[PDB]
């Protein structure tokens, strides 16, 4: 009946967990789980009570499992890679360092193919792919000798990078493509050798694949990255999740499509066309989903179950080839980061608060009325909010309109049409009398000739500049500035402002004096350093304006 259930939740921090890191895996009814912390949890799926609880040191970054063997690998961060037999004779278990293998310690990321193990290990500027044997017989669970190493030369460094296992058809915790595609992406080498291929998404958002057959090296024989590792498609943002989908569904699925995700959500999907040159050509889409994308799984039939911090949303690529857009629906679950998809769709996730939940998607005589009551109360509940959003839209619009008028005047002002049409500032010389002394006054007249109304957000800045030649000795007053709001000016319309310039102290008026008028536009008022000042005229008062007969 309830499409979602509660299993458990946890110690969360504030808000909840970050992404890249926490991992959940579903075996049969066995369930695997990290919280990107020092704990790895296993839940019996029947009754969401715990089987087993493993304290590592140092924040588990990844889990994978080899089900035949009945083995769970973990990467501790500053330590290496542990291994655990699932039978494994309080329900807390600390690990013994017994279990540690390749304490390589600077290894971040790692996959598994059949009985091969791949790591991608931190260094200076060059990260390197290493690649180990993993003993096929039921022994002491050992590394063996490192077959291969490279250095991802293009990569020169919160966000892990990522690794995918991608096998071609005929030949496993990974993704089997179909021949069309495999041949298209990796080339004839990987095709012929039927070589499984390892896809690295890195924080730069370079998205690189390495063929495993061509990765055997030695101390005489040093793996050349330039040629051995290769670079598909540069998402400009970091990578989160690579995958592969059954488009056209008409356990080993011969998948048809390849999926990348950026962090901010440039999703990137790929397919074969075989079109328009009588030739196989690659089909590239960069979509732009929402938001921050926080984690992503894949389900039955071209359906990519993702998260934003808003909600848990979906794209379908099952449908020229693939599609114009991903416009995408929630199932109205929050930001779960750490999502997994089994196929039977019944998916599993970690709610950003702290929670493990299990989303399993799919008349009356006056109980029908209670239905109608409920529905109308609901539409009532919402109309409220729609109305708010309306008025907000109003405000944004009115902003653009005012904006528009501003930009149109600005452009008129910056043009030399050979008359300063839109707005003028005339300034003009008066004698007056105060107290005893005849004073020199500047009436500065602003006139709107044009249609355009200089509304709110606008301001005149006047500056009264003395004599020039900055001297040996710097004066008391280099200049004065007056600044004024111009509010709702309107067309034809007019301000007059009076300034003294005249001998205040010591009978000292030095000429020529220039008065400069300018305008600013204020972004904030109506709603890195940000405004615009615009020049009006700049009138020089000379003796001939200040003589009195």
């Amino acid at each position: 009946a309830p499409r979602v259930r509660y299993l458990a939740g946890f110690c969360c921090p504030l808000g909840g967990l970050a992404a890249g890191k926490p991992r959940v895996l579903c075996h049969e009814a066995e369930v695997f789980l990290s919280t990107g912390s020092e704990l790895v949890y296993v839940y019996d799926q029947e009754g969401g009570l715990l089987t087993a609880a493993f304290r590592f040191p140092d924040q588990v970054w990844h889990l994978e499992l080899l089900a035949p063997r009945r083995l769970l690998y973990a990467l501790c961060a500053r330590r290496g890679l542990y291994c655990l037999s699932l039978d494994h004779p309080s329900p807390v278990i600390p690990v013994d360092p017994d279990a540690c293998i390749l304490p390589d310690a600077a290894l971040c990321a790692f996959t598994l193919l059949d009985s091969v193990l791949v790591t991608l290990v931190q260094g200076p500027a060059r990260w390197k792919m290493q690649l180990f044997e993993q003993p096929c017989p039921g022994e002491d669970p050992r590394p063996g000798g490192q077959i291969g190493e490279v250095e991802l030369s293009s990569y020169t460094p919160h966000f892990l990078p990522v690794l995918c296992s991608v096998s071609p058809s005929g030949s496993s915790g990974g993704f089997t493509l179909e021949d069309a595609l495999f041949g298209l992406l990796f080339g004839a080498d990987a095709t012929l050798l039927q070589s499984p291929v390892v896809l690295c998404g890195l924080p730069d958002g370079q998205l690189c694949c390495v063929i495993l057959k061509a990765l055997v090296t030695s101390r005489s024989a040093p793996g050349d990255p330039n040629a051995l590792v290769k670079i598909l498609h540069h998402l400009e943002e970091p990578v989160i999740f690579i995958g592969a989908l059954k488009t056209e569904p008409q356990e080993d699925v011969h998948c048809d499509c390849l999926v990348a995700f950026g962090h901010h959500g440039r999703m990137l999907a790929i397919k074969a066309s075989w079109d328009e040159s009588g030739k196989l050509v690659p089909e590239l889409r960069e979509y732009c989903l929402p938001g921050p994308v926080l984690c992503a799984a894949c389900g039955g039939g071209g359906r990519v179950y993702h998260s934003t911090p808003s909600d848990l949303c979906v794209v379908d690529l099952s449908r020229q080839p693939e599609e114009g857009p991903g416009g995408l629906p929630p199932m109205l679950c929050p930001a779960s980061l750490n999502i997994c998809s089994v196929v039977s769709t019944k998916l599993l996730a970690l709610s950003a608060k702290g929670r493990l939940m299990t989303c399993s998607l799919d008349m009356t005589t006056e109980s029908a009325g209670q239905k109608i009551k409920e529905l109308l109360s609901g539409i009532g509940n919402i109309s409220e909010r729609v109305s708010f959003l309306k008025k907000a839209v109003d405000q944004r619009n009115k902003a653009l309109t005012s904006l528009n008028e501003a930009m149109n005047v600005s452009c008129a002002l910056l043009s030399s049409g050979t008359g300063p049409r839109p707005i003028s500032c005339t300034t003009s010389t008066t004698w007056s009398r105060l107290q005893t002394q005849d004073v020199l006054m500047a009436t500065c007249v602003l006139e709107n000739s044009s249609s355009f109304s200089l509304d709110q957000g606008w301001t005149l800045c006047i500056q009264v500049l003395t004599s020039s030649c900055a001297l040996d000795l710097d004066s008391a007053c280099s200049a004065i500035t007056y600044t004024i709001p111009v509010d709702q000016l309107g067309p034809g319309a007019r301000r007059e402002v009076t300034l003294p310039l005249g001998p205040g102290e010591n009978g000292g008026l030095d000429l020529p004096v220039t008065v400069s008028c300018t305008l600013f536009y204020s972004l904030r008022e109506v709603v890195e350093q940000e405004g615009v000042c615009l020049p009006l005229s700049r009138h020089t008062v000379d003796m001939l304006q200040c003589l009195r007969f």
């Binding site: 309830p2 921090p13 504030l14 808000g15 807390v92 009325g369 909010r385 940000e530």
Partner: protein, 463 residues
């Protein structure tokens, strides 16, 4: 409620726990758990399981003290806690912290055993961590340590408590002061001490580096945001004596602050627009969890025990959108109505996208305005000084800027948002050249403006 036959509620994992103490007779009172869940078919709460814990000593005054989820520090799993008092009439009060499992079984962690009763701001915290006060004496007992401890510091209030990134455990009691709960004592970018007189309950919501984004609510029935202590987006609250806030999600972005009042009444306020979206009355209780299994939070409202001597009769479960449940053919309108509901929701969730798009265009076009009219930092920086009734603003220059060739000034420009009128603003400009350690060699050219102050302090403030 808090008594020998009286209960308390809680929410665990999209369901509702009832802890009731019950005099069993042979013996002393037993704690009984019901763990309930919502049917959606029969539109009621149905008992899924029970639980019992038998208490030994034949002493009266057993009492539930508080209840919530917490997270044990050992496992890191959200778990119900509960706190029991035992009082013997000895002036001795035990104060058990007992934890419940997946299995509906109980587990002691602290006995803790005071002589004097606990009261005021009891608040249980991650590593199941009791923290109380009497007469301005703060004490805590970690489950780790197992000792009574005192907080060294001397505070009036302990308004918020909880774990943060990098620190582990913290308190905000005085809005400067910013503790730990081992090594007692950043208090840099919190709220103003102006508010500190009126703030009665805080709720953080997020932490970056230190920068906390955070809410209040006051004795004045206010509600308030802050982003680096910039008091944005206030409301006003209908009711008197606000207690607390929770948060609720409602789906995408639709985030409400479900405020409870000592007056047995409560709000929702709708973030996006600090606005009372709904208000209800008498509200015996309130809980924020998914009782349906949709995948988004709701609120449960409980109405009073006058109605029945029974708890979860008189409920009202609600998203406050699409979901609303409570305690002549007509049908052909139904599919139309459901279809309206879902299409009103489509309009909501579209517009919200619409509104963001408008914001975005506006910004885009200013930046267009700025490259329209038009690299090297020609100015050091801004600084300002108050002398008497004189504003002195200044600026340090760079060697790039040649005052030999360039007449310069500096104005001041008032915000009309503050200044409803046109007062003119005059500013006097000085150029100051000083030689720095003369006994090439650095000159310091500084440029600086001067004006009156009392004209600007009209709105207690200005920018």
């Amino acid at each position: 409620m808090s008594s020998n036959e009286q209960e308390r509620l809680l929410c665990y994992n999209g369901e509702v726990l009832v802890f009731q103490l019950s005099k069993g007779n042979t013996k002393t009172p037993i704690l009984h758990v019901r763990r309930m869940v919502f049917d959606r078919g029969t539109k009621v709460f149905v008992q899924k399981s029970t639980g019992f814990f038998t208490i030994k000593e034949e002493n009266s005054h057993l009492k539930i003290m508080c209840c919530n989820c917490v997270s044990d520090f050992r496992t890191g799993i959200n778990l119900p806690y509960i706190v029991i008092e035992k009082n013997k009439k000895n002036n001795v009060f035990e104060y058990f912290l007992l934890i419940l499992h997946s299995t509906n079984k109980f587990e002691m962690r602290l006995s803790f055993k005071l002589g004097y009763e606990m009261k005021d701001g009891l608040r249980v915290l991650n590593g199941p961590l009791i923290l109380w006060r009497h007469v301005k004496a703060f004490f805590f007992i970690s489950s780790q340590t197992g000792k009574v401890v005192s907080v060294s510091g001397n505070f009036s209030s302990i308004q918020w408590a909880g774990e943060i990134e990098n620190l582990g455990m913290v308190l905000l009691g005085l809005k400067e002061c910013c503790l730990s709960e081992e090594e007692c004592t950043s208090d840099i970018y919190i709220i103003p001490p102006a508010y500190s007189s009126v703030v009665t309950y805080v709720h953080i919501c997020a932490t970056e580096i230190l920068r906390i984004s955070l809410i209040a609510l006051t004795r004045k029935n206010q509600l308030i945001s802050f982003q680096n202590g910039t008091p944005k987006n206030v409301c006003q609250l209908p009711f008197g004596d606000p207690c607390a806030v929770q948060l609720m999600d409602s789906g995408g972005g639709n985030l409400f602050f479900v405020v409870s009042f000592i007056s047995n009444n409560a709000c929702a306020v709708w973030k996006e627009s600090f606005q009372v979206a709904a208000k209800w009355e008498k509200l015996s209780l309130v809980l924020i969890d998914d009782f349906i299994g949709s995948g988004t939070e709701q609120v449960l409202l409980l109405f009073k025990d006058s109605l029945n001597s029974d708890c979860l009769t008189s409920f009202k479960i609600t998203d406050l959108g699409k979901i609303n449940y409570s305690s002549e053919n007509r049908y052909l309108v139904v599919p139309p109505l459901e279809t309206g509901l879902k299409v009103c929701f489509s309009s909501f969730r579209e517009l919200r996208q619409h509104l963001l798009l408008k914001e975005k265009i506006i910004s885009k076009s200013y930046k267009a305005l700025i490259n329209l009219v038009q690299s090297e930092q020609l100015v050091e920086k801004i600084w300002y000084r108050v002398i008497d009734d004189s504003l002195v603003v200044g600026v340090k220059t760079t060697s790039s800027l040649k005052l030999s060739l360039n007449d310069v000034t500096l104005s001041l420009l008032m915000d009309q948002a503050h200044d409803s009128r046109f007062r003119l603003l005059k500013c006097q400009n000085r150029v100051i050249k000083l030689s720095t350690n003369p006994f090439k060699k650095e000159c310091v050219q500084i440029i600086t403006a001067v004006t009156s102050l009392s004209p600007l302090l009209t709105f207690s403030k200005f920018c």
